[PDB]
Amino acid sequence: EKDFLPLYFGWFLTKKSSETLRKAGQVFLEELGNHKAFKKELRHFISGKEKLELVSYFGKRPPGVLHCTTKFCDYGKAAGAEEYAQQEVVKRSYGKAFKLSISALFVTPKTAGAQVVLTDQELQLWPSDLASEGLPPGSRAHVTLGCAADVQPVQTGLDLLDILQQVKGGSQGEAVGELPRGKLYSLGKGRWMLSLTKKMEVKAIFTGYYG
Ligand SMILES: Nc1ncnc2c1ncn2[C@@H]1O[C@H](CO)[C@@H](O)[C@H]1OP(=O)(O)O
C-alpha cells in the first residue's frame, strides 16, 4: 500500500516556549482590551460603553502546545501535500530543532496571533503553494493564539497578510500607545498590532501532527 501524511507539518513549540508565548499572548489581550485606544473603536470591532474582554472573545485557543504551521496536508488530500512531504529538506528537517523569531502580536475581529519571521533555512520548509499581495514568501508565517467562535482555520494567516499589506502601504500610522513589550498600532477595521521592541525567540521542533 502507501504511507499517508500528517494532517499538517509545522514547528511545534517546546512546553517552555509554548507557555511563555501563550502567557504573553493573554497579557497582550488583557492590556489591549483595557487600552483606551481600543475601546474607542469597539464599534469597528464588533457589531453588538461596556467593556469587551478579549481573552473571552478569543475563546477558541490552541489547547496543547502552540505551533507554526507550514504545509496543511490533510493526510494527502490537500493540493501539493504529497509534493511538499516528498521534498528532501522536509525529510531532513523532520525532528530537527529550530528557533523562531516572533516580531509582533496581532488582533483582528476573527483571530489573535503572533507574527513569525522565518530565517532563510526555515523558509526552505515553507510550501511554494503559498492574491500574492506583493509580499515575500513566508509572510503568512504565524502562531495562532486564539479565534473568534465562528472562525475557521486558515483565517489567522489571511488576517496577518492583510495587516502586513497595510503596513507595507505605510498606512499603519503613528503608534496609538506604548505597551511594556512595544508600540501599539491601530490599523482600523478592528485590526491591532504590537510591534515587539525585542523580537521574542521560541524553541520548536519541526514535525508532523496526525491528530
Ligand atoms: N487550509 C487549511 N485548512 C485547515 N487548516 C489549515 C489550513 N492551512 C493552514 N492550516 C493550519 O492547520 C492547523 C489545523 O487546522 C491550524 O493551525 C491551521 O493554522 P491556523 O493557526 O491559521 O488556524
PDB file of all heavy atoms in Angstrom, residues 5-7 9 70-85 87 127-130:
ATOM      1  N   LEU A   5       0.163  10.968   4.951  1.00  0.00           N
ATOM      2  CA  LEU A   5       0.886  12.085   5.527  1.00  0.00           C
ATOM      3  C   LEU A   5       0.206  12.593   6.790  1.00  0.00           C
ATOM      4  O   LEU A   5      -0.862  12.112   7.162  1.00  0.00           O
ATOM      5  CB  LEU A   5       0.993  13.209   4.498  1.00  0.00           C
ATOM      6  CG  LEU A   5       1.213  12.752   3.058  1.00  0.00           C
ATOM      7  CD1 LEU A   5       1.338  13.957   2.145  1.00  0.00           C
ATOM      8  CD2 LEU A   5       2.446  11.868   2.954  1.00  0.00           C
ATOM      9  N   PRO A   6       0.826  13.569   7.459  1.00  0.00           N
ATOM     10  CA  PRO A   6       0.186  14.181   8.619  1.00  0.00           C
ATOM     11  C   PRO A   6      -1.011  15.024   8.214  1.00  0.00           C
ATOM     12  O   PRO A   6      -1.219  15.256   7.029  1.00  0.00           O
ATOM     13  CB  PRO A   6       1.288  15.068   9.209  1.00  0.00           C
ATOM     14  CG  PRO A   6       2.564  14.555   8.621  1.00  0.00           C
ATOM     15  CD  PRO A   6       2.190  14.087   7.262  1.00  0.00           C
ATOM     16  N   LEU A   7      -1.779  15.470   9.195  1.00  0.00           N
ATOM     17  CA  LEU A   7      -2.801  16.478   8.970  1.00  0.00           C
ATOM     18  C   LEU A   7      -2.081  17.746   8.523  1.00  0.00           C
ATOM     19  O   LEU A   7      -2.518  18.433   7.607  1.00  0.00           O
ATOM     20  CB  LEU A   7      -3.617  16.702  10.242  1.00  0.00           C
ATOM     21  CG  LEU A   7      -4.704  17.773  10.242  1.00  0.00           C
ATOM     22  CD1 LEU A   7      -5.860  17.377   9.345  1.00  0.00           C
ATOM     23  CD2 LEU A   7      -5.169  17.994  11.665  1.00  0.00           C
ATOM     24  N   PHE A   9       2.244  19.688   8.626  1.00  0.00           N
ATOM     25  CA  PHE A   9       3.609  19.851   9.102  1.00  0.00           C
ATOM     26  C   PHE A   9       3.729  21.190   9.799  1.00  0.00           C
ATOM     27  O   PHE A   9       2.952  22.107   9.532  1.00  0.00           O
ATOM     28  CB  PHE A   9       4.607  19.792   7.946  1.00  0.00           C
ATOM     29  CG  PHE A   9       4.793  18.425   7.373  1.00  0.00           C
ATOM     30  CD1 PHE A   9       3.961  17.954   6.379  1.00  0.00           C
ATOM     31  CD2 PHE A   9       5.819  17.609   7.826  1.00  0.00           C
ATOM     32  CE1 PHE A   9       4.142  16.693   5.842  1.00  0.00           C
ATOM     33  CE2 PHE A   9       6.006  16.349   7.297  1.00  0.00           C
ATOM     34  CZ  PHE A   9       5.166  15.887   6.307  1.00  0.00           C
ATOM     35  N   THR A  70       3.443  24.914   8.577  1.00  0.00           N
ATOM     36  CA  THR A  70       3.965  25.131   7.236  1.00  0.00           C
ATOM     37  C   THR A  70       2.926  24.657   6.229  1.00  0.00           C
ATOM     38  O   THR A  70       2.109  25.450   5.753  1.00  0.00           O
ATOM     39  CB  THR A  70       5.327  24.410   7.013  1.00  0.00           C
ATOM     40  OG1 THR A  70       5.229  23.032   7.390  1.00  0.00           O
ATOM     41  CG2 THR A  70       6.404  25.068   7.843  1.00  0.00           C
ATOM     42  N   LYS A  71       2.929  23.361   5.937  1.00  0.00           N
ATOM     43  CA  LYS A  71       2.010  22.805   4.955  1.00  0.00           C
ATOM     44  C   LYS A  71       0.874  22.024   5.609  1.00  0.00           C
ATOM     45  O   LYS A  71       1.096  21.023   6.288  1.00  0.00           O
ATOM     46  CB  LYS A  71       2.755  21.894   3.981  1.00  0.00           C
ATOM     47  CG  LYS A  71       1.872  21.323   2.871  1.00  0.00           C
ATOM     48  CD  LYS A  71       1.257  22.419   2.010  1.00  0.00           C
ATOM     49  CE  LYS A  71       0.445  21.830   0.871  1.00  0.00           C
ATOM     50  NZ  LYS A  71       0.092  22.846  -0.154  1.00  0.00           N
ATOM     51  N   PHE A  72      -0.347  22.499   5.403  1.00  0.00           N
ATOM     52  CA  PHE A  72      -1.524  21.728   5.764  1.00  0.00           C
ATOM     53  C   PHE A  72      -1.763  20.672   4.697  1.00  0.00           C
ATOM     54  O   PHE A  72      -2.000  21.002   3.535  1.00  0.00           O
ATOM     55  CB  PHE A  72      -2.746  22.634   5.908  1.00  0.00           C
ATOM     56  CG  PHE A  72      -4.010  21.895   6.225  1.00  0.00           C
ATOM     57  CD1 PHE A  72      -4.277  21.475   7.517  1.00  0.00           C
ATOM     58  CD2 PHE A  72      -4.929  21.618   5.233  1.00  0.00           C
ATOM     59  CE1 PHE A  72      -5.450  20.792   7.811  1.00  0.00           C
ATOM     60  CE2 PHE A  72      -6.096  20.934   5.520  1.00  0.00           C
ATOM     61  CZ  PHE A  72      -6.353  20.521   6.808  1.00  0.00           C
ATOM     62  N   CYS A  73      -1.718  19.404   5.101  1.00  0.00           N
ATOM     63  CA  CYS A  73      -1.729  18.291   4.154  1.00  0.00           C
ATOM     64  C   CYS A  73      -3.038  17.509   4.094  1.00  0.00           C
ATOM     65  O   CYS A  73      -3.349  16.909   3.074  1.00  0.00           O
ATOM     66  CB  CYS A  73      -0.591  17.321   4.505  1.00  0.00           C
ATOM     67  SG  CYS A  73       1.045  17.988   4.190  1.00  0.00           S
ATOM     68  N   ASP A  74      -3.781  17.504   5.196  1.00  0.00           N
ATOM     69  CA  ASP A  74      -4.994  16.696   5.329  1.00  0.00           C
ATOM     70  C   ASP A  74      -4.752  15.254   4.874  1.00  0.00           C
ATOM     71  O   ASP A  74      -5.531  14.691   4.106  1.00  0.00           O
ATOM     72  CB  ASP A  74      -6.153  17.326   4.539  1.00  0.00           C
ATOM     73  CG  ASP A  74      -7.515  16.796   4.968  1.00  0.00           C
ATOM     74  OD1 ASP A  74      -7.599  16.135   6.026  1.00  0.00           O
ATOM     75  OD2 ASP A  74      -8.507  17.036   4.244  1.00  0.00           O
ATOM     76  N   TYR A  75      -3.653  14.678   5.350  1.00  0.00           N
ATOM     77  CA  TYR A  75      -3.300  13.287   5.076  1.00  0.00           C
ATOM     78  C   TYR A  75      -3.076  13.009   3.595  1.00  0.00           C
ATOM     79  O   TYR A  75      -3.181  11.867   3.155  1.00  0.00           O
ATOM     80  CB  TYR A  75      -4.385  12.352   5.617  1.00  0.00           C
ATOM     81  CG  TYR A  75      -4.793  12.674   7.034  1.00  0.00           C
ATOM     82  CD1 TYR A  75      -6.036  13.212   7.313  1.00  0.00           C
ATOM     83  CD2 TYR A  75      -3.926  12.442   8.096  1.00  0.00           C
ATOM     84  CE1 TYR A  75      -6.411  13.514   8.606  1.00  0.00           C
ATOM     85  CE2 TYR A  75      -4.292  12.742   9.394  1.00  0.00           C
ATOM     86  CZ  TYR A  75      -5.538  13.278   9.642  1.00  0.00           C
ATOM     87  OH  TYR A  75      -5.911  13.580  10.930  1.00  0.00           O
ATOM     88  N   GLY A  76      -2.755  14.052   2.834  1.00  0.00           N
ATOM     89  CA  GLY A  76      -2.509  13.921   1.406  1.00  0.00           C
ATOM     90  C   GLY A  76      -3.647  14.456   0.558  1.00  0.00           C
ATOM     91  O   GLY A  76      -3.519  14.603  -0.659  1.00  0.00           O
ATOM     92  N   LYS A  77      -4.772  14.750   1.201  1.00  0.00           N
ATOM     93  CA  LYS A  77      -5.945  15.237   0.493  1.00  0.00           C
ATOM     94  C   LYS A  77      -5.739  16.641  -0.067  1.00  0.00           C
ATOM     95  O   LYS A  77      -6.338  17.000  -1.076  1.00  0.00           O
ATOM     96  CB  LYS A  77      -7.166  15.226   1.415  1.00  0.00           C
ATOM     97  CG  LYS A  77      -7.641  13.837   1.809  1.00  0.00           C
ATOM     98  CD  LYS A  77      -8.768  13.915   2.823  1.00  0.00           C
ATOM     99  CE  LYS A  77      -9.280  12.540   3.210  1.00  0.00           C
ATOM    100  NZ  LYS A  77     -10.607  12.625   3.888  1.00  0.00           N
ATOM    101  N   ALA A  78      -4.890  17.434   0.580  1.00  0.00           N
ATOM    102  CA  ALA A  78      -4.707  18.828   0.182  1.00  0.00           C
ATOM    103  C   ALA A  78      -3.766  18.927  -1.008  1.00  0.00           C
ATOM    104  O   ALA A  78      -2.813  18.157  -1.118  1.00  0.00           O
ATOM    105  CB  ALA A  78      -4.183  19.650   1.341  1.00  0.00           C
ATOM    106  N   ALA A  79      -4.042  19.874  -1.899  1.00  0.00           N
ATOM    107  CA  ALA A  79      -3.231  20.053  -3.097  1.00  0.00           C
ATOM    108  C   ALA A  79      -1.765  20.262  -2.719  1.00  0.00           C
ATOM    109  O   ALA A  79      -1.447  21.059  -1.834  1.00  0.00           O
ATOM    110  CB  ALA A  79      -3.745  21.223  -3.918  1.00  0.00           C
ATOM    111  N   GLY A  80      -0.880  19.517  -3.371  1.00  0.00           N
ATOM    112  CA  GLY A  80       0.548  19.675  -3.164  1.00  0.00           C
ATOM    113  C   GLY A  80       1.075  19.071  -1.874  1.00  0.00           C
ATOM    114  O   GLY A  80       2.275  19.171  -1.587  1.00  0.00           O
ATOM    115  N   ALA A  81       0.196  18.446  -1.093  1.00  0.00           N
ATOM    116  CA  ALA A  81       0.609  17.826   0.167  1.00  0.00           C
ATOM    117  C   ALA A  81       1.716  16.805  -0.054  1.00  0.00           C
ATOM    118  O   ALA A  81       2.736  16.826   0.638  1.00  0.00           O
ATOM    119  CB  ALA A  81      -0.573  17.164   0.851  1.00  0.00           C
ATOM    120  N   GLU A  82       1.511  15.905  -1.011  1.00  0.00           N
ATOM    121  CA  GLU A  82       2.479  14.849  -1.284  1.00  0.00           C
ATOM    122  C   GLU A  82       3.797  15.425  -1.786  1.00  0.00           C
ATOM    123  O   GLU A  82       4.871  14.989  -1.371  1.00  0.00           O
ATOM    124  CB  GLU A  82       1.916  13.853  -2.299  1.00  0.00           C
ATOM    125  CG  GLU A  82       1.062  12.760  -1.673  1.00  0.00           C
ATOM    126  CD  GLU A  82       0.257  11.984  -2.697  1.00  0.00           C
ATOM    127  OE1 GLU A  82       0.788  10.997  -3.251  1.00  0.00           O
ATOM    128  OE2 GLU A  82      -0.911  12.359  -2.945  1.00  0.00           O
ATOM    129  N   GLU A  83       3.714  16.412  -2.670  1.00  0.00           N
ATOM    130  CA  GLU A  83       4.915  17.029  -3.215  1.00  0.00           C
ATOM    131  C   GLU A  83       5.720  17.749  -2.132  1.00  0.00           C
ATOM    132  O   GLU A  83       6.949  17.717  -2.149  1.00  0.00           O
ATOM    133  CB  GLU A  83       4.560  18.002  -4.336  1.00  0.00           C
ATOM    134  CG  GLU A  83       3.862  17.346  -5.526  1.00  0.00           C
ATOM    135  CD  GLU A  83       2.343  17.451  -5.456  1.00  0.00           C
ATOM    136  OE1 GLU A  83       1.741  16.932  -4.488  1.00  0.00           O
ATOM    137  OE2 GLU A  83       1.751  18.060  -6.376  1.00  0.00           O
ATOM    138  N   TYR A  84       5.037  18.392  -1.190  1.00  0.00           N
ATOM    139  CA  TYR A  84       5.727  19.057  -0.088  1.00  0.00           C
ATOM    140  C   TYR A  84       6.438  18.039   0.795  1.00  0.00           C
ATOM    141  O   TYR A  84       7.607  18.204   1.137  1.00  0.00           O
ATOM    142  CB  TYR A  84       4.749  19.881   0.753  1.00  0.00           C
ATOM    143  CG  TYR A  84       5.372  20.502   1.987  1.00  0.00           C
ATOM    144  CD1 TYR A  84       6.007  21.737   1.924  1.00  0.00           C
ATOM    145  CD2 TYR A  84       5.327  19.855   3.213  1.00  0.00           C
ATOM    146  CE1 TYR A  84       6.583  22.307   3.053  1.00  0.00           C
ATOM    147  CE2 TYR A  84       5.896  20.416   4.345  1.00  0.00           C
ATOM    148  CZ  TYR A  84       6.523  21.644   4.260  1.00  0.00           C
ATOM    149  OH  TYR A  84       7.091  22.199   5.390  1.00  0.00           O
ATOM    150  N   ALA A  85       5.723  16.981   1.156  1.00  0.00           N
ATOM    151  CA  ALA A  85       6.244  15.986   2.083  1.00  0.00           C
ATOM    152  C   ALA A  85       7.409  15.199   1.482  1.00  0.00           C
ATOM    153  O   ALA A  85       8.296  14.737   2.208  1.00  0.00           O
ATOM    154  CB  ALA A  85       5.127  15.039   2.510  1.00  0.00           C
ATOM    155  N   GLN A  87       9.719  16.332  -0.427  1.00  0.00           N
ATOM    156  CA  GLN A  87      10.932  17.150  -0.500  1.00  0.00           C
ATOM    157  C   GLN A  87      12.012  16.630   0.436  1.00  0.00           C
ATOM    158  O   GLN A  87      11.700  16.150   1.521  1.00  0.00           O
ATOM    159  CB  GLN A  87      10.633  18.604  -0.138  1.00  0.00           C
ATOM    160  CG  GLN A  87       9.787  19.365  -1.134  1.00  0.00           C
ATOM    161  CD  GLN A  87       9.693  20.825  -0.765  1.00  0.00           C
ATOM    162  OE1 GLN A  87      10.235  21.688  -1.454  1.00  0.00           O
ATOM    163  NE2 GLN A  87       9.017  21.111   0.339  1.00  0.00           N
ATOM    164  N   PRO A 127       5.826  26.032   2.127  1.00  0.00           N
ATOM    165  CA  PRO A 127       5.295  25.474   0.879  1.00  0.00           C
ATOM    166  C   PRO A 127       5.254  26.505  -0.239  1.00  0.00           C
ATOM    167  O   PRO A 127       4.930  27.664   0.018  1.00  0.00           O
ATOM    168  CB  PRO A 127       3.874  25.025   1.255  1.00  0.00           C
ATOM    169  CG  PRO A 127       3.678  25.381   2.707  1.00  0.00           C
ATOM    170  CD  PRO A 127       4.757  26.326   3.095  1.00  0.00           C
ATOM    171  N   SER A 128       5.580  26.091  -1.459  1.00  0.00           N
ATOM    172  CA  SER A 128       5.565  27.006  -2.599  1.00  0.00           C
ATOM    173  C   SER A 128       4.138  27.248  -3.095  1.00  0.00           C
ATOM    174  O   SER A 128       3.900  28.147  -3.901  1.00  0.00           O
ATOM    175  CB  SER A 128       6.435  26.462  -3.736  1.00  0.00           C
ATOM    176  OG  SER A 128       5.968  25.203  -4.188  1.00  0.00           O
ATOM    177  N   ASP A 129       3.195  26.447  -2.608  1.00  0.00           N
ATOM    178  CA  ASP A 129       1.785  26.632  -2.939  1.00  0.00           C
ATOM    179  C   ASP A 129       1.297  28.004  -2.481  1.00  0.00           C
ATOM    180  O   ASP A 129       0.378  28.572  -3.070  1.00  0.00           O
ATOM    181  CB  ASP A 129       0.929  25.538  -2.297  1.00  0.00           C
ATOM    182  CG  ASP A 129       1.271  24.151  -2.808  1.00  0.00           C
ATOM    183  OD1 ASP A 129       0.729  23.754  -3.862  1.00  0.00           O
ATOM    184  OD2 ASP A 129       2.079  23.456  -2.152  1.00  0.00           O
ATOM    185  N   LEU A 130       1.918  28.525  -1.426  1.00  0.00           N
ATOM    186  CA  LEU A 130       1.544  29.821  -0.867  1.00  0.00           C
ATOM    187  C   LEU A 130       2.310  30.951  -1.552  1.00  0.00           C
ATOM    188  O   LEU A 130       2.830  30.784  -2.655  1.00  0.00           O
ATOM    189  CB  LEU A 130       1.804  29.852   0.643  1.00  0.00           C
ATOM    190  CG  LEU A 130       0.825  29.098   1.554  1.00  0.00           C
ATOM    191  CD1 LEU A 130       0.670  27.633   1.158  1.00  0.00           C
ATOM    192  CD2 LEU A 130       1.281  29.207   3.001  1.00  0.00           C
TER     193      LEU A 130
END
